[model samples]
Target: HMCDAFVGTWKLVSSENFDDYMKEVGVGFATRKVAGMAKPNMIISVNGDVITIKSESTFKNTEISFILGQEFDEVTADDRKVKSTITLDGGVLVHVQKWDGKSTTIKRKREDDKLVVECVMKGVTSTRVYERA
Candidate 1:
């Protein structure tokens, strides 16, 4: 299973254009600044048909757990409430989050030994890459 490739601790390596993505999602300027400056740690684990991700940073931390093809209510670290689902395709984990009828699609995959996350909202996209730690 591609899930096998996702279990590990990862450190933020680089993030690009996240500020625009956060802004599109209505994050306040101050909070966005802090988030833009923080380096987050991501811990991923799998249990049965589900996976949980725990993200930590000096600015904020949050844990999210989900099952493949199953939807759930999720409260984001930036304090938005959304419907969330994660699905696996090939070696990629695609996550869809919807709030107020607006949806964001995020694709995450292991590129070489690093985790790459591509986030798109309102047509603006950002990419964040993480290295195994």
Candidate 2:
């Protein structure tokens, strides 16, 4: 029930303050430039207790498979190795990644027919909007 709203293909439409957010996450300027230009498609699927999320783009394709509320090792798109967990808090999917004593939280929610992803690293926050494809 918690993953029902996220079981679909979504296309990136717009982003806000993404560069600043990436900077806060310690991404290099070169990689951030490439990452900022690449619009990725988010594909999510569920099988049994595992949920798979694939972020596909021309620059990179990263995928992860994990169970809700269980911590797993994750290599982020920015290439940071972290301990990650995702849980449903009401209607929102809350994903938290921790590494080197720092952490980031990403909240994904369905708004109307669109998907909104809010990413927060420390005090910096960014939002990327996606539409159903």
Candidate 3:
């Protein structure tokens, strides 16, 4: 019952210091220009060990599905077009991405009335917090 609280639809309300985060991921200036302006839509659904997140925006759309504690490849919207592994580290979802022979880690968690996402790539780390909408 504790975990059921996280299943739902969420909207992108506001982002904090995401520009630097994108820069660290080596997201091209042109793409970041559009990405920054995008209002991403996210939906998280869970059933037993399986979990899915659908991220949608006018510029792009992506759906990620995986089981808890399992890793799977996922495609991203960057020019490098990363393929990454997402797994659950305890209650926090972690994403490990590979690009140009380098790897990065992104972590996600839910706390009280907010969702927190953090990422560390190319020696830079950023965190974004969101509330229910």
Q: Write the per-residue lDDT of candidate 1 for residues 36-62, one digit (tens) a residue.
A: 998999999988877999999998899
Better of 2 and 3 by TM-score: 2
> Would you list the rank order by TM-score, best first?
2, 1, 3
Best by lDDT: 2
Off by over 4 Å in 1: none
Candidate 3 lDDT by residue in tens digits, 7-114: 777777667667788887778898988988888777788877777788788978888788655656666866555666777667887888776787888787888877
Q: Between prediction 1 and prediction 3, which has the larger lDDT? A: 1
Q: What are the per-residue Cα lDDT tens digits for candidate 2 across 7-40?
A: 9999999999999999999999999999999899
Q: Cα deviation in Å at residue 76, candidate 3?
A: 0.2
Tell me the whole-model lDDT of each prediction, alpha carbons only. Answer: 0.91, 0.93, 0.75
Best by TM-score: 2
* Deviation from native of the Cα of residue 60 in model 1, angstroms: 1.2
Report the error of model 2 at residue 125, Å.
0.6
Q: Residue 86 in model 3: shift from native, Å?
A: 2.2
1 against 2, candidate with superior TM-score: 2
Name the 10 consecutive residues with the lowest summed lDDT in model 1: 1-10
